[PDB]
Enzyme design. Structure first.
Site, PDB file in Angstrom:
ATOM      1  N   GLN A  64       0.825  -1.204   0.000  1.00  0.00           N
ATOM      2  CA  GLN A  64       0.000   0.000   0.000  1.00  0.00           C
ATOM      3  C   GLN A  64       0.859   1.252   0.000  1.00  0.00           C
ATOM      4  OE1 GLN A  64      -2.994   0.425   3.156  1.00  0.00           O
ATOM      5  NE2 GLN A  64      -3.980   1.865   1.753  1.00  0.00           N
ATOM      6  N   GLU A 112      -3.247  -7.151  -2.182  1.00  0.00           N
ATOM      7  CA  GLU A 112      -4.564  -6.616  -1.875  1.00  0.00           C
ATOM      8  C   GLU A 112      -5.130  -5.903  -3.090  1.00  0.00           C
ATOM      9  OE1 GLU A 112      -4.412  -4.378   1.717  1.00  0.00           O
ATOM     10  OE2 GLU A 112      -6.577  -4.465   2.069  1.00  0.00           O
ATOM     11  N   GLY A 120       3.629  -7.001   5.611  1.00  0.00           N
ATOM     12  CA  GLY A 120       3.884  -8.247   4.904  1.00  0.00           C
ATOM     13  C   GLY A 120       4.103  -8.046   3.417  1.00  0.00           C
ATOM     14  N   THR A 121       3.221  -7.278   2.773  1.00  0.00           N
ATOM     15  CA  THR A 121       3.391  -6.986   1.354  1.00  0.00           C
ATOM     16  C   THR A 121       4.686  -6.227   1.109  1.00  0.00           C
ATOM     17  OG1 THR A 121       1.884  -5.136   1.752  1.00  0.00           O
ATOM     18  CG2 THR A 121       0.987  -7.089   0.653  1.00  0.00           C
ATOM     19  N   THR A 138       1.821   2.337  13.693  1.00  0.00           N
ATOM     20  CA  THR A 138       0.479   1.875  13.386  1.00  0.00           C
ATOM     21  C   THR A 138       0.341   0.361  13.364  1.00  0.00           C
ATOM     22  OG1 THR A 138      -1.362   2.112  11.828  1.00  0.00           O
ATOM     23  CG2 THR A 138       0.847   1.852  10.908  1.00  0.00           C
ATOM     24  N   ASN A 193       7.992   8.075   8.938  1.00  0.00           N
ATOM     25  CA  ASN A 193       6.771   8.866   8.902  1.00  0.00           C
ATOM     26  C   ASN A 193       6.756   9.910  10.005  1.00  0.00           C
ATOM     27  OD1 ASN A 193       5.973   7.366   6.742  1.00  0.00           O
ATOM     28  ND2 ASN A 193       4.295   6.305   7.784  1.00  0.00           N
ATOM     29  N   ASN A 226       3.731  11.388   0.991  1.00  0.00           N
ATOM     30  CA  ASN A 226       4.108  10.843  -0.305  1.00  0.00           C
ATOM     31  C   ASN A 226       4.502  11.944  -1.275  1.00  0.00           C
ATOM     32  OD1 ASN A 226       3.148   8.675   1.098  1.00  0.00           O
ATOM     33  ND2 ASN A 226       1.379   8.303  -0.225  1.00  0.00           N
ATOM     34  N   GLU A 284      26.750   5.940 -10.392  1.00  0.00           N
ATOM     35  CA  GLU A 284      27.764   6.598  -9.585  1.00  0.00           C
ATOM     36  C   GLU A 284      27.248   7.044  -8.223  1.00  0.00           C
ATOM     37  OE1 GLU A 284      29.336   9.858 -11.678  1.00  0.00           O
ATOM     38  OE2 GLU A 284      27.671  11.222 -11.292  1.00  0.00           O
TER      39      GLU A 284
HETATM   40  N1  GTP Z   1       4.834   7.338   4.364  1.00  0.00           N
HETATM   41  C1  GTP Z   1       3.784   6.575   4.083  1.00  0.00           C
HETATM   42  N2  GTP Z   1       3.652   5.340   4.680  1.00  0.00           N
HETATM   43  C2  GTP Z   1       2.584   4.560   4.403  1.00  0.00           C
HETATM   44  C3  GTP Z   1       1.618   4.988   3.513  1.00  0.00           C
HETATM   45  N3  GTP Z   1       0.682   4.025   3.420  1.00  0.00           N
HETATM   46  C4  GTP Z   1       1.031   2.999   4.224  1.00  0.00           C
HETATM   47  N4  GTP Z   1       2.203   3.322   4.846  1.00  0.00           N
HETATM   48  C5  GTP Z   1       2.939   2.470   5.786  1.00  0.00           C
HETATM   49  O1  GTP Z   1       2.925   1.151   5.278  1.00  0.00           O
HETATM   50  C6  GTP Z   1       2.791   0.209   6.317  1.00  0.00           C
HETATM   51  C7  GTP Z   1       1.976  -0.998   5.852  1.00  0.00           C
HETATM   52  O2  GTP Z   1       2.010  -1.100   4.446  1.00  0.00           O
HETATM   53  P1  GTP Z   1       1.584  -2.462   3.699  1.00  0.00           P
HETATM   54  O3  GTP Z   1       2.395  -3.624   4.202  1.00  0.00           O
HETATM   55  O4  GTP Z   1       1.778  -2.293   2.218  1.00  0.00           O
HETATM   56  O5  GTP Z   1       0.019  -2.683   3.988  1.00  0.00           O
HETATM   57  P2  GTP Z   1      -0.866  -3.609   3.009  1.00  0.00           P
HETATM   58  O6  GTP Z   1      -1.013  -3.032   1.627  1.00  0.00           O
HETATM   59  O7  GTP Z   1      -2.211  -3.872   3.632  1.00  0.00           O
HETATM   60  O8  GTP Z   1      -0.032  -4.974   2.947  1.00  0.00           O
HETATM   61  P3  GTP Z   1       0.199  -5.830   4.278  1.00  0.00           P
HETATM   62  O9  GTP Z   1      -0.071  -4.960   5.477  1.00  0.00           O
HETATM   63  O10 GTP Z   1       1.630  -6.291   4.278  1.00  0.00           O
HETATM   64  O11 GTP Z   1      -0.717  -7.025   4.299  1.00  0.00           O
HETATM   65  C8  GTP Z   1       2.136   0.950   7.469  1.00  0.00           C
HETATM   66  O12 GTP Z   1       2.832   0.686   8.662  1.00  0.00           O
HETATM   67  C9  GTP Z   1       2.247   2.425   7.131  1.00  0.00           C
HETATM   68  O13 GTP Z   1       3.017   3.095   8.096  1.00  0.00           O
HETATM   69  C10 GTP Z   1       1.745   6.225   2.908  1.00  0.00           C
HETATM   70  O14 GTP Z   1       0.891   6.617   2.122  1.00  0.00           O
HETATM   71  N5  GTP Z   1       2.831   7.019   3.196  1.00  0.00           N
END
Ligand code: GTP
Ligand code: GTP
Ligand code: GDP
Lengths: 431, 33, 430, 202, 48, 430
Positions: F11, F63, F136-137, F171, F198, F220, F246
């Site tokens: 995500q 997802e 995880g992702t 989170t 973050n 972002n 480089e």
């Molecule tokens: N800086 C930033 N961090 C983000 C953002 N969106 C998600 N995160 C971070 O990404 C982490 C989780 O991302 P993901 O693992 O991809 O969540 P997911 O798509 O549901 O996949 P899984 O949780 O692994 O099952 C969280 O702890 C957030 O802190 C974003 O838009 N900006």
């Protein structure tokens, strides 16, 4: 006044002939309606070499178009210069040869060959003096290869002393168009060795390489390949058609190129082929032209000259140039690449100079190389022919047309003996 | 005449636009890519 | 001058003929009424003095329903009313019924009309026989018609676009029986037999066209596109023109081996169009993909003996050479040791026309890959045990016996299919 | 570089061309002064550098480097690109113009509804996916413009009049926007489409 | 050069990095980072 | 010629990719539909037959919701439909789930599309993997894809812009777990890993942007500006051109020490814009301020090893030289003894483009400072006890064990991170 009778055979031969005749009409200032519109007396000096005059100012090509299917020459007539040709010289069958050399040489060629020879004789008798016949066709196709070889044999029988010049599109090495290409090429090479006095080998893949690397075109149609081939066919005979500082006819080129009768297969190259981007950046000088001539990429044959040794090499230059420059350049080339030249010939270069360059070009040059590199081309075609002949793949198509199996063996034996000739003179040492 | 000219003109326009537009850059098509 | 006579036998024949003639009318601009608002139609239509174009086709069936559907559909005024030939009783999926009792008079009249059609053709490239191997009308009557055509016309090229039973999915029970019988029949008569499977075309429609509910109209549209690409060189000029007679010379190494796998590319719906490059190399690779094949027969099991490519549209010979060279250098594609070339490329300047209301999209490039390969022995191996499993118990044998056959006919068909199996094994082996 | 014609004659005499007076005058007249003897030496040298006999350009293919494959007569103009010998043909039985109370119009409506129902319902929930794709906006109600745009997204050649007929036939509840319920009701597999297709005599 | 300079300097780097206990390193860095965290949380801003 | 393949996993990866690709489209003038009304787009975009520019990016996720947001959003006609790859089941913040059980087929399809994309590139500078360490992702699938890319592609420089857990605010609960696992995974597979936090970006938004309510879109946007400033030298010419290859040679003193702090300057809203000089020296000082760093880590704790500066806009080599000389003479900023230069300055003539609707102002000068420093071992010390505190109780260990992991794998990851701590101490030492 040394007339040349042009013959086009098959689809590829007809397309190449259409391109060549359009190029020659451009060079002699002939519009698609046949009238002369050049405003230069040099154009009409020797127009009789290729054309005959009509009742008016119209000029008709001394061309004979051959096919077993009418569609290809319907396209030829629909082309921009389809109306110059005399409609009587279009000789067609009705059922085309299915890429079958047997069909184009024995069954379906037999009926049409009488008309073909009648047209050839009618065109040849009108000639004041006949230099010979030039036949453009493709090895690896039924009607083209079979009918062309049959006509070449017939014309050889009728006119032995006259020159026979052939422009054969040998099947390309790496990509094969039709499956039966080794069969047709093997059967046609056997006829060309015995009958054709002079032969130029062209490969479509080599033409693609040269048009993509030198001209730098990314989507080259068959029109571009036919354009390059037509440029070569024009440049080979420009000495007959225009005054030259040191002129040289087809017979002179054959004498200076062919050491022994069977070794008459040549690879050709045309210079200067310049990309559109580097046209202004390139310098038209005799050394530059020679450097581009002797490059292996400039060869329109798949075989590269580096592997073999140059038995002979003619260079027909065009333009107002120094004969000293020309001779010194090719002598320097010989001295530098003496390893690539045959030792037992003191001079492997036949220089010819014509005073009239092609339209738009300050200078140009066509190169005709008799080299033992063509040995590998024949060897590859024989490698394919043997693989197919061992299991008789597609052999029933030729067998059912009334051709003996022994004919294939004889053709392959002849072609292997020619390969042996080329190898033996490649590794032949003086004394 | 129309069909052949259409084919040739399409090929020429594709050449111009390339200079499917990455096919001239394929490794197998040309070594320099 | 390049006329080709179309024959459509059985329900499958007539239903693929509907799509084929719709496609040809769309391609040549011929309205359904018959006339168009040159001479590119001569291969498929003959023009009359009034300007009306009538197809050189013959719709043969022992069931009146399918032919009356043509008589009642949009294409009423196009086809010749006598060219539509209808029987009174269906063959009832009985090869004996369609070949010995009912089919005699119907095929005799079919020869009559075929002779009348052939007398209208200056040239004649050959016949395009579209039937259904696996049904009495298609199998029996089609076999009888093919035998009569071989007897009388002789050397005319008969190209049979046969539809064989799919491996596990099927619609009939005696389909192995009449399939084996018709296979024995057409092993010795047809010149090139293009093999087709409903399961394979269904998978094509499901994966490429995203149609999870394919129907016979979709299948027939795909088959019609394949045949139009195959015949495009007869009607439209192109570089590397390929002829009906050139098919067999560049595709048939031995007379017994003339069955051909067909694969069309690209197969893309309207939504998925213009989103990938769809270049010459990519469409060639798609055509050589096993999934795009129109026969449930993995080519990886066998070896390609010959591959004839029909390119349609903006295809440049350098690109076709590059794509075919990539295919040759690819390890997955395997050719027989005795065919170093194994390729017959042919280009045509006419892009494939799109049927309005169909699922196919407008593509500027197209490939029809027709290959002779030893893998095709696999499907005959499937039918050879599907047949013998039933024939051990002599199930449904009395039905075939009642209409004038013998157990010897079944035995001979099975033996000939075994001989064909061994021939394929021998040509595949070194 | 601006040299008078007399200066050019003097230059040729100095360069020992060996020409007569008339020949030198003709060689000088080969170039033409711009304003008053404004020809420059580079222009004169360009004139005499490549004589170019044969007259140069003409109606033909020409040399490979200079001119393309195509004829000069069949060239210098891009005509015949996107050349269609036969114009696109509509689906048979579909009326371009709307007619009131005609069996032809009824058959056209039945055929068009059947075609749309066959294009949709090809997989499960495809009707739902197409419905969601009809409307760019966030509301489920389908506008007339959304309906025309979705039908255009489908590879169907149907006139605006017949599309509006479909829009009205799909019950708008006299509201002018298509709901999912009515969308499904008219674009169901078989049902109204099949019934209208079969009922020719009605 | 190796033996006189690089071997000597790496040997003296070792038995010092090796001598430093990992737990001591973790605790030291933790005291530092928690001091920074505390000043970040209490004070409105942090300046170098 | 200078193509770089972008991958967005998870995500967070996809959501920062939205901002990145919006920024590139705005920079090159590419409309969201796909096409624009020389060849500066080739680094990120390949132009097709219609003239449409498609990005060389791959949106990977297990997802479907995050990817469907792109499929429905304004950038639906830009990206390739098959480039958007969607799974069926989310990784549920389980590294084992995203690396061992669910991620297999998805990563196989990912390598397929990545090969298709790479075959469209003459050259290939490398990969830009954008994921989220802490899910995880992001962790598992990203680690698997990095492993596969290292295996097959080989020498391509893989830059991982990883988003690591914030020190105190977070989170997820298993975030230390999967963060340590992913750190062990990418310690050997990425070439240059960029740390992002973050909490630090939130502090930057709160102070510099005066945003009391920062959100993921804001974060972002800053990340996208940082990455675009990083790649600006690939697409635009300028004095002291800087290259992807480089980055390593000027930045990675030892292969293990390739984790990098990033800091952007200036970070100022429109209202505070045009109110200060914003000269090169001032913006360089701001970039070296601890507050401007996008990771919650005091640079004063450790010693800088290398600092690569990417200037955008009206920057002159005198100004950059004087600013860096002042920074070196400054006593607070401490560099290691073994790297006397430790600076890689590179300028670009293209000022940073401003995304409409964003908070960043139109500044004629910008600096992206990416520093390899030994201070970053301090955040690793945070995660190393956040890990082991839970690992003592083996909390949430059964969740990871269920999908094919072992206690040994956690132990090995934690031990590798301890070895990294030792490495940081040694390289900081003399
Ligand atoms: N800086 C930033 N961090 C983000 C953002 N969106 C998600 N995160 C971070 O990404 C982490 C989780 O991302 P993901 O693992 O991809 O969540 P997911 O798509 O549901 O996949 P899984 O949780 O692994 O099952 C969280 O702890 C957030 O802190 C974003 O838009 N900006
Ligand atoms: N590909 C394809 N196959 C079809 C189609 N329609 C029918 N078939 C096949 O054709 C076979 C039967 O065809 P026919 O023998 O002509 O059926 P019929 O016309 O009633 O004649 P009999 O069954 O022999 O009495 C079935 O097994 C189907 O698999 C079609 O539209 N497309
Ligand atoms: N240069 C060139 N080669 C062609 C052309 N058309 C066909 N060929 C090549 O000629 C070879 C033989 O085909 P061809 O002899 O024309 O077939 P045939 O007319 O039936 O005998 C094929 O392998 C083609 O690659 C063309 O227009 N130009």
């Amino acid at each position: 006044m040394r007339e040349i009778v042009h013959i086009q055979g098959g689809q590829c031969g007809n397309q190449i002939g259409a391109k060549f005749w359009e190029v020659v009409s451009d060079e002699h200032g002939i519009d698609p309606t046949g009238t002369y519109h050049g405003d230069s007396d040099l154009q009409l000096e020797r127009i009789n070499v290729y054309f005959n005059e009509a009742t008016g100012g119209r000029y008709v090509p001394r061309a004979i178009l051959m096919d077993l299917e009418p569609g290809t020459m319907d396209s030829v007539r629909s082309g921009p210069y389809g109306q110059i040709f005399r409609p009587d010289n279009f000789v067609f069958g009705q059922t085309g040869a299915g890429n079958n050399w047997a069909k184009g040489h024995y069954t379906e060629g037999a009926e049409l060959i009488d008309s073909v020879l009648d047209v050839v004789r009618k065109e040849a008798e009108s000639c004041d003096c006949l230099q010979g016949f030039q036949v453009c066709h493709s090895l690896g196709g039924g009607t083209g290869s079979g009918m062309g070889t049959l006509l070449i044999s017939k014309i050889r029988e009728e006119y032995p002393d006259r020159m026979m010049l052939t422009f054969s599109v040998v099947p390309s090495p790496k990509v094969s168009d039709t499956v039966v290409e080794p069969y047709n090429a093997t059967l046609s090479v056997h006829q060309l060795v015995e009958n054709a006095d002079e032969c130029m080998v062209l490969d479509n893949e080599a033409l693609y390489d040269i048009c993509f690397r030198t001209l730098k075109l990314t989507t080259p149609t068959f029109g571009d390949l036919n354009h390059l081939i037509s440029a070569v066919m024009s440049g080979i005979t420009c000495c007959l058609r225009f005054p030259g500082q040191l002129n040289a006819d087809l017979r002179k080129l054959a004498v200076n190129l062919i050491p022994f009768p069977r070794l008459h297969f040549f690879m050709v190259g045309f210079t200067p082929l310049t990309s559109r981007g580097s046209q202004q950046y390139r310098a038209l000088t005799v050394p530059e032209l020679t450097q581009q001539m002797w490059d292996a990429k400039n060869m329109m044959c798949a075989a590269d000259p580096r592997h073999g040794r140059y038995l002979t090499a003619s260079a027909l230059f065009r333009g107002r140039m120094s004969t000293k420059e020309v001779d010194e350049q090719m002598l320097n080339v010989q001295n530098k690449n003496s390893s690539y030249f045959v030792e037992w010939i003191p001079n492997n270069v036949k220089s010819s100079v014509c005073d009239i360059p092609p339209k738009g070009l300050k200078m140009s040059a066509t190169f005709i190389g008799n080299s033992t590199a063509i040995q590998e081309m024949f060897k590859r075609v024989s490698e394919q022919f043997t693989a197919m002949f061992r299991r008789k793949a597609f052999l029933h198509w030729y067998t059912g047309e009334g051709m003996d199996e022994m004919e294939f063996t004889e053709a392959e034996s002849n072609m292997n003996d020619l390969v042996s000739e080329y190898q033996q003179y490649q590794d032949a040492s003086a004394e | 005449r129309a069909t052949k000219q259409r084919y040739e003109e399409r090929a020429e326009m594709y050449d111009r636009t390339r200079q499917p537009f990455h096919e001239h850059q394929l490794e197998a098509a040309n070594t320099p890519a | 001058m390049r006329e080709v006579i179309s024959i459509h036998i059985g329900q499958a024949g007539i239903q693929v003929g509907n799509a084929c003639w719709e496609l040809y009318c769309l391609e040549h601009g011929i309205q359904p009424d018959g006339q168009m608002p040159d001479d590119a139609f001569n291969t498929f239509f003959s023009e009359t003095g009034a300007g009306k174009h009538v197809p050189r086709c013959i719709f043969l069936d022992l069931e009146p329903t399918v032919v009356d559907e043509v008589r009642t559909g949009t294409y009423r005024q196009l086809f010749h009313p006598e060219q539509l030939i209808s029987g009174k009783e269906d063959a009832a999926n009985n090869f004996a019924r369609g070949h010995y009792t009912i089919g005699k008079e119907i095929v005799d009249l079919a020869l009559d009309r075929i002779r009348k059609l052939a007398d209208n053709c200056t040239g004649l490239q050959g016949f395009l026989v579209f039937n259904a191997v696996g049904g009495g009308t298609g199998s029996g009557l089609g076999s009888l018609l093919l035998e009569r055509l071989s007897v009388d016309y002789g050397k005319k090229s008969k190209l049979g676009f046969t539809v064989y039973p799919s491996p596990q999915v099927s619609t009939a029970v005696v389909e192995p029986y009449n399939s084996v019988l018709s296979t024995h029949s057409l092993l010795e008569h047809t010149d090139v037999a293009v093999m087709l499977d409903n399961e394979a075309i269904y998978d094509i429609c499901r994966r490429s066209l995203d149609i999870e509910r394919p129907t016979y109209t979709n299948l027939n549209r795909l088959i019609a596109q394949v045949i139009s690409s195959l015949t495009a060189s007869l009607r439209f000029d192109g570089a590397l023109n390929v002829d009906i007679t050139e098919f067999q010379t560049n595709l048939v190494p031995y007379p017994r081996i003339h069955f051909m796998l067909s694969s069309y590319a690209p197969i893309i719906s309207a939504e998925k169009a213009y989103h990938e490059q769809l270049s010459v190399a990519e469409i060639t690779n798609a055509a050589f993909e096993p999934a795009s094949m129109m026969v449930k027969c993995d080519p990886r099991h066998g070896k390609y003996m010959a591959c004839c490519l029909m390119y349609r549209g903006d295809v440049v010979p350098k690109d076709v050479n590059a794509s075919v060279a990539t295919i040759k250098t690819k390890r997955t594609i395997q050719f027989v040791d005795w065919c170093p070339t194994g390729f017959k490329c042919g280009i045509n300047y006419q892009p494939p026309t799109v049927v309005p209301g169909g699922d196919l999209a407008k593509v500027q490039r197209a490939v029809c890959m027709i290959s002779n390969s030893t893998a095709i022995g696999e499907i005959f191996s499937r039918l050879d045990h599907k047949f013998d499993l039933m024939y051990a118990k002599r199930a449904f044998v009395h039905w075939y016996v009642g209409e004038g056959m013998e157990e010897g006919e079944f035995s001979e068909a099975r033996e000939d299919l075994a001989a064909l199996e061994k021939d394929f094994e021998e040509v595949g082996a070194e | 570089g601006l040299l008078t014609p007399d200066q050019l004659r003097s230059a040729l005499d100095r360069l020992h061309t060996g020409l007569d007076a008339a020949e030198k005058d003709r060689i000088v007249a080969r170039v033409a002064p711009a304003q008053h003897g404004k020809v420059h030496y580079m222009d004169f040298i360009r004139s005499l550098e490549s004589p170019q006999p044969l007259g140069g350009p003409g109606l033909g293919v020409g040399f490979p480097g200079v001119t393309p494959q195509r004829a000069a007569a069949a060239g210098t103009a891009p005509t015949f690109w996107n050349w269609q010998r036969h114009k696109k043909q509509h689906v048979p039985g579909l009326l371009e113009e709307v007619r009131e109370g005609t069996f032809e119009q009824a058959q056209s409506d039945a055929l068009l509804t059947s075609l749309m129902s066959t294009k949709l319902n090809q997989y499960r929930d495809k009707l739902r996916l197409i419905f969601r794709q009809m409307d760019g906006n966030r509301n489920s109600l389908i506008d007339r413009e959304e309906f025309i745009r979705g039908i255009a997204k489908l590879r169907i050649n149907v006139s605006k009049a017949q599309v509006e007929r479909l829009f009205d036939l799909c019950d708008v509840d006299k509201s002018g926007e298509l709901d999912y319920e009515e969308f499904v009701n008219r674009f169901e597999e078989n049902g109204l489409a099949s019934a209208a297709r079969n009922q020719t005599r009605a | 050069w190796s033996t006189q300079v690089f071997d000597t300097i790496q040997g003296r780097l070792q038995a010092a990095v090796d001598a430093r206990d990992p737990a001591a390193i973790e605790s030291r860095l933790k005291t530092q980072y928690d001091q920074y965290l505390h000043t970040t949380n209490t004070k409105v801003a942090v300046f170098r």
